Amino acid sequence: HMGFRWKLAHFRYLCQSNALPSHVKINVSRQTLFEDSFQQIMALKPYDLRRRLYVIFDYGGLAREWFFLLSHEVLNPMYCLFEYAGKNLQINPASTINPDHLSYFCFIGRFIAMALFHGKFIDTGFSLPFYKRMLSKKLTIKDLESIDTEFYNSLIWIRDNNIEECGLEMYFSVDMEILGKVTSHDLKLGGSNILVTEENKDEYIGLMTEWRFSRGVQEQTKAFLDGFNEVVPLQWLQYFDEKELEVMLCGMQEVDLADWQRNTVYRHYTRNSKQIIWFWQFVKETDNEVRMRLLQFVTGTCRLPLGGFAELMGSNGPQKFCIEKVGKDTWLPRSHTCFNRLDLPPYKSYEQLKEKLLFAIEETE
Amino acid sequence: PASMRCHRAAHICSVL
Ligand SMILES: *CC(=O)Nc1ccc(NC(=O)C*)cc1
């Protein structure tokens, strides 16, 4: 958003002026691709990855074929490093089964950073809240909605219903059981011994939210970030937001508007609603950068499934792009990425709708 | 309330 083309130009100049002379050769096989890349990369010092890359299985299309293939294999549930933990991806908290998991996550972060450094695209992709963690950005309760609907619904219920008439007795500590461990966690020092009360709702909600992102995955995330930071230091991503970081890694595809429009569903709206006529008119005029940022804001990603918009998936299964009327023309638009849902208030004119979309697309998360 | 609240409180602790 805003000056994004300026943002990446500055980044490409950063990598280019930090490059190193000479090269590193990487020998790999087709069927053993991820064991071999692991051993050849991890044997090299991190700044050696800033040199020219030579992958013998053009002399730069081999590199792209490496970054695509290895991208699929490292995020492939086989070494048990990643768990979908949605439905039909993210770090698996049961990766401790692998005694060397922390070594594999170091490699994965180094590899993701090589892709950015060398301006190559990966065909895998983490969630927006993961990219916010890479950018040291505050994680919100809406990010919670994107990872864990049912955990989100419970915290919302505590937030605006008094839990005294409910009989809720809660404390500032949460268990978690991974591989039959049952590990307690004190949200603060001595937290298991403080009752959650109507005065301290806000904090508890905030601590519970922050704890949910890194449950069973702190060590793994710390290793990923340490390895990444060794190749491309994280402070070079300083001007970017999570939506821009995703595009930089995944690349841009152009959206098929006929395919989008015929696979959209409506709640308390129709194709004959003027707010829908205006909406489809808005996306016909804007850039395709705006279209992709709008797919991000609504579905949670810029990537489109194999099949097009008909195949869109959300939480409990198939979930097509959806628009729903809420509130009044004074409200701002908002979204629920788990449901691929846009909450579009009933604005009064085309211009008001265009101004309020573009604000939500470009300025809010 | 036809045994309300009681079933949500049990559900909220079970989730959290
Ligand atoms: C009827 C009823 O009150 N059920 C109930 C209340 C609370 C809880 N658990 C906690 O408060 C943690 C379970 C069941």
Author numbering:
A (entry chain A): 544 to 600, 607 to 637, 641 to 917
B (entry chain B): 2 to 17
Original paper wording:
Characterizing Helicon-E3 co-structures and mechanisms of action, we identified new binding sites for α-helices on the E3 surfaces, as well as potential probes of the disease-linked E3, WWP123,24, highlighting the generality of our approach against this therapeutically important target class.
First, we focused on the NEDD4-like E3 ligases, which make up approximately a third of the HECT family. These include WWP1 and WWP2, which each consist of four tandem WW domains and a catalytic HECT domain at the C-terminus that transfers ubiquitin from a bound E2 first to itself and subsequently to the target substrate. We began by designing three HECT-containing protein constructs: a construct that stabilizes the autoinhibited, inactive state of WWP1 (WWP1WW-HECT), and WWP1/2 constructs that are able to adopt both the active and inactive conformations (WWP1HECT and WWP2HECT). We next solved the crystal structures of five Helicons, four in complex with WWP2HECT representing all three groups of HECT-binding clusters, and one from Group 1 with WWP1HECT. In all of the structures, we found that the HECT domains adopted similarly closed (inhibited) conformations.
